[PDB]
Design an enzyme around this catalytic site. Structure first.
Site, PDB file in Angstrom:
ATOM      1  CG  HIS A   1      -2.605  36.815 -12.505  1.00 27.14           C
ATOM      2  ND1 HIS A   1      -3.736  36.893 -11.724  1.00 27.14           N
ATOM      3  CD2 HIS A   1      -2.564  35.554 -12.994  1.00 27.14           C
ATOM      4  CE1 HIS A   1      -4.347  35.718 -11.727  1.00 27.14           C
ATOM      5  NE2 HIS A   1      -3.660  34.891 -12.496  1.00 27.14           N
TER       6      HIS A   1
ATOM      7  CG  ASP B   1      -4.147  40.051 -10.224  1.00 25.98           C
ATOM      8  OD1 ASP B   1      -4.837  39.035 -10.420  1.00 25.98           O
ATOM      9  OD2 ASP B   1      -2.931  40.101 -10.462  1.00 25.98           O
TER      10      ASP B   1
ATOM     11  CG  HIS C   1      -0.678  28.989 -15.470  1.00 26.72           C
ATOM     12  ND1 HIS C   1       0.185  30.036 -15.225  1.00 26.72           N
ATOM     13  CD2 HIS C   1      -1.788  29.234 -14.731  1.00 26.72           C
ATOM     14  CE1 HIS C   1      -0.370  30.869 -14.361  1.00 26.72           C
ATOM     15  NE2 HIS C   1      -1.571  30.408 -14.047  1.00 26.72           N
ATOM     16  CD  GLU C   2      -5.176  27.719 -15.799  1.00 25.35           C
ATOM     17  OE1 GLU C   2      -5.482  27.733 -14.588  1.00 25.35           O
ATOM     18  OE2 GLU C   2      -4.903  28.754 -16.443  1.00 25.35           O
TER      19      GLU C   2
ATOM     20  CE1 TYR D   1      -3.605  32.330  -7.849  1.00 26.97           C
ATOM     21  CE2 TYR D   1      -5.665  33.548  -7.886  1.00 26.97           C
ATOM     22  CZ  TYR D   1      -4.565  33.031  -8.545  1.00 26.97           C
ATOM     23  OH  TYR D   1      -4.411  33.242  -9.902  1.00 26.97           O
TER      24      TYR D   1
ATOM     25  CD  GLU E   1      -1.214  33.091 -11.310  1.00 23.98           C
ATOM     26  OE1 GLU E   1      -0.703  33.226 -12.446  1.00 23.98           O
ATOM     27  OE2 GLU E   1      -2.137  32.288 -11.061  1.00 23.98           O
TER      28      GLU E   1
ATOM     29  CG  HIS F   1      -3.099  27.383 -10.457  1.00 25.09           C
ATOM     30  ND1 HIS F   1      -2.400  28.217  -9.612  1.00 25.09           N
ATOM     31  CD2 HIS F   1      -3.397  28.120 -11.554  1.00 25.09           C
ATOM     32  CE1 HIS F   1      -2.266  29.408 -10.178  1.00 25.09           C
ATOM     33  NE2 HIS F   1      -2.870  29.377 -11.355  1.00 25.09           N
TER      34      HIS F   1
ATOM     35  CG  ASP G   1       0.419  40.113 -28.537  1.00 28.02           C
ATOM     36  OD1 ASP G   1       0.368  39.054 -29.198  1.00 28.02           O
ATOM     37  OD2 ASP G   1      -0.591  40.801 -28.260  1.00 28.02           O
TER      38      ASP G   1
HETATM   39  C1  LIG Z   1      -6.358  37.896 -18.750  1.00 29.42           C
HETATM   40  C2  LIG Z   1      -6.242  36.660 -17.852  1.00 29.42           C
HETATM   41  C3  LIG Z   1      -6.254  35.415 -18.666  1.00 29.42           C
HETATM   42  C4  LIG Z   1      -5.069  36.760 -16.901  1.00 29.42           C
HETATM   43  C5  LIG Z   1      -5.051  36.020 -15.576  1.00 29.42           C
HETATM   44  N1  LIG Z   1      -5.259  34.584 -15.685  1.00 29.42           N
HETATM   45  C6  LIG Z   1      -4.089  33.694 -15.835  1.00 29.42           C
HETATM   46  O1  LIG Z   1      -2.950  34.168 -15.880  1.00 29.42           O
HETATM   47  C7  LIG Z   1      -4.355  32.229 -15.975  1.00 29.42           C
HETATM   48  C8  LIG Z   1      -4.624  31.945 -17.467  1.00 29.42           C
HETATM   49  C9  LIG Z   1      -3.479  32.265 -18.475  1.00 29.42           C
HETATM   50  C10 LIG Z   1      -2.251  31.376 -18.251  1.00 29.42           C
HETATM   51  C11 LIG Z   1      -3.973  32.256 -19.860  1.00 29.42           C
HETATM   52  N2  LIG Z   1      -5.564  31.823 -15.300  1.00 29.42           N
HETATM   53  P1  LIG Z   1      -5.460  31.523 -13.652  1.00 29.42           P
HETATM   54  O2  LIG Z   1      -5.489  30.012 -13.314  1.00 29.42           O
HETATM   55  O3  LIG Z   1      -4.179  32.153 -13.053  1.00 29.42           O
HETATM   56  C12 LIG Z   1      -6.953  32.306 -12.992  1.00 29.42           C
HETATM   57  N3  LIG Z   1      -7.042  32.149 -11.557  1.00 29.42           N
HETATM   58  C13 LIG Z   1      -8.320  32.434 -10.975  1.00 29.42           C
HETATM   59  O4  LIG Z   1      -9.313  32.214 -11.595  1.00 29.42           O
HETATM   60  O5  LIG Z   1      -8.305  32.298  -9.625  1.00 29.42           O
HETATM   61  C14 LIG Z   1      -9.479  32.455  -8.857  1.00 29.42           C
HETATM   62  C15 LIG Z   1     -10.112  31.162  -8.358  1.00 29.42           C
HETATM   63  C16 LIG Z   1      -9.775  30.677  -7.106  1.00 29.42           C
HETATM   64  C17 LIG Z   1     -10.355  29.499  -6.647  1.00 29.42           C
HETATM   65  C18 LIG Z   1     -11.261  28.817  -7.438  1.00 29.42           C
HETATM   66  C19 LIG Z   1     -11.597  29.299  -8.695  1.00 29.42           C
HETATM   67  C20 LIG Z   1     -11.014  30.486  -9.154  1.00 29.42           C
HETATM   68  C21 LIG Z   1      -6.059  36.543 -14.577  1.00 29.42           C
HETATM   69  O6  LIG Z   1      -6.922  35.762 -14.086  1.00 29.42           O
HETATM   70  O7  LIG Z   1      -6.007  37.753 -14.220  1.00 29.42           O
HETATM   71 CA   LIG Z   2      -1.155  37.544 -30.318  1.00 28.00          CA
HETATM   72 ZN   LIG Z   3      -2.717  31.051 -12.489  1.00 31.25          ZN
END
Ligand SMILES: CC(C)C[C@H](NC(=O)[C@H](CC(C)C)NP(=O)(O)CNC(=O)OCc1ccccc1)C(=O)O
Ligand SMILES: [Ca+2]
Ligand SMILES: [Zn+2]
Ligand SMILES: [Ca+2]
Ligand SMILES: [Ca+2]
Ligand SMILES: [Ca+2]
Length: 316
Positions: A231, A226, A142-143, A157, A166, A146, A200
């Protein structure tokens, strides 16, 4: 660094033993020279300065608890590189074998992971909401996805383009999980989310509504949290992708599944040839329909299934 390529061994976050590509020069560094211009893994040492220090180890054995998130970030970055190269003929995230950098042990009790514009970053979690997040192959992919998106479509974003951004990361995160073929599913983050709760996950692509997310355009989030629900509204596109691959009847609309490989081809083509930084959901539908047409022909089942899936989630 300059050194000779070697192969270390260690255990990942879930306690599984694996070999990792390292580089020897006085120390053994987490530097994999076998893939493009290298995969490099760094220790952020519980702080937030990035990237931190290139991961160094005295004996090329990575069995300490502190080692585990580094082992997995490094190894799963390799698997993801292999997926993009072998499946899509794409060399790293930029298509030109850019070095792939990750930092682990970011901050303290950090319940997230991200691409910061230049590298991947993984928290250790707080031990309750998450264990170290690089333990999830879908998370690592996923990362890195991006980065792929930023170098290609460049989806902004926020709002609908951000929700597509996403979903693309969840889609390919999942396709990489299936590629590695270890306990694959259409859930996101299940391997590292809530160690005290079995069964979960953070999101579900097959049934987004089980973790609070919309599975139809009529249920889209329109507020400001968000980044306008990136997300959250991703659930609408994740559901469409799930239906294209696996089929199903959703709100009375039946979709004929065409399988994961064709899903991957259709969405990779959309991402790299059709989507733009400001594409909305309707434009994604058009992009996917055109991609499927390019690949399989306008009267194909594949094209019909893409249409069925977007119909089912209310995206015209
Ligand atoms: C509870 C969290 C982990 C849920 C969610 N994050 C996610 O769904 C995934 C991690 C997951 C696959 C474990 N992390 P993500 O890459 O989408 C966080 N994005 C995020 O950090 O974007 C902001 C950003 C923009 C530019 C530079 C730096 C930061 C969120 O940020 O809301
Ligand atoms: Ca769990
Ligand atoms: Zn992401
Ligand atoms: Ca060691
Ligand atoms: Ca899984
Ligand atoms: Ca998963």
């Amino acid at each position: 660094i300059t050194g000779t390529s070697t192969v270390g061994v260690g255990r990942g976050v879930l306690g599984d033993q694996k070999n990792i590509n390292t580089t020897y020069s006085t120390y053994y560094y987490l530097q994999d020279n076998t893939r493009g211009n290298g995969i490099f893994t760094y220790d952020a040492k519980y702080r937030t300065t990035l990237p931190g220090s290139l991961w160094a180890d005295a004996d090329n054995q990575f069995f300490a608890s502190y080692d585990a998130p580094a082992v997995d970030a490094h190894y799963y970055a390799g698997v993801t590189y292999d997926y993009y190269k072998n499946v899509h003929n794409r060399l790293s995230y930029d298509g030109n074998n850019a070095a792939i950098r990750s930092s682990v042990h970011y901050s303290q009790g950090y319940n997230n992971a991200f691409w910061n514009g230049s590298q991947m970053v993984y928290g250790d979690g707080d031990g309750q909401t998450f264990i170290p997040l690089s333990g999830g192959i879908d998370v690592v992919a996923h990362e890195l996805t991006h980065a792929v998106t930023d170098y290609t479509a460049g989806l902004i974003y926020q709002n609908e383009s951000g929700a597509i951004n996403e979903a693309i990361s969840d889609i390919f995160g999942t396709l990489v999980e299936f590629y590695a073929n270890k306990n694959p599913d259409w859930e996101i983050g299940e391997d590292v989310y809530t160690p005290g709760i079995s069964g979960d996950s953070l999101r579900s692509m097959s049934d987004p509504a089980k973790y609070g997310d919309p599975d139809h355009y009529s249920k889209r989030y329109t507020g400001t949290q968000d980044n306008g629900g990136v997300h959250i509204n991703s659930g609408i596109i994740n559901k469409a992708a799930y239906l294209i691959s696996q089929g199903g009847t959703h709100y009375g609309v039946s979709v004929v599944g065409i399988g994961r490989d064709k899903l991957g081809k259709i969405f990779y083509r959309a991402l790299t040839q059709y989507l733009t930084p400001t594409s909305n959901f309707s434009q994604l539908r058009a992009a996917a329909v055109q991609s499927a047409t390019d690949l399989y022909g306008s009267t194909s089942q594949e094209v019909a299934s893409v249409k069925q899936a977007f119909d089912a989630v209310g995206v015209k």
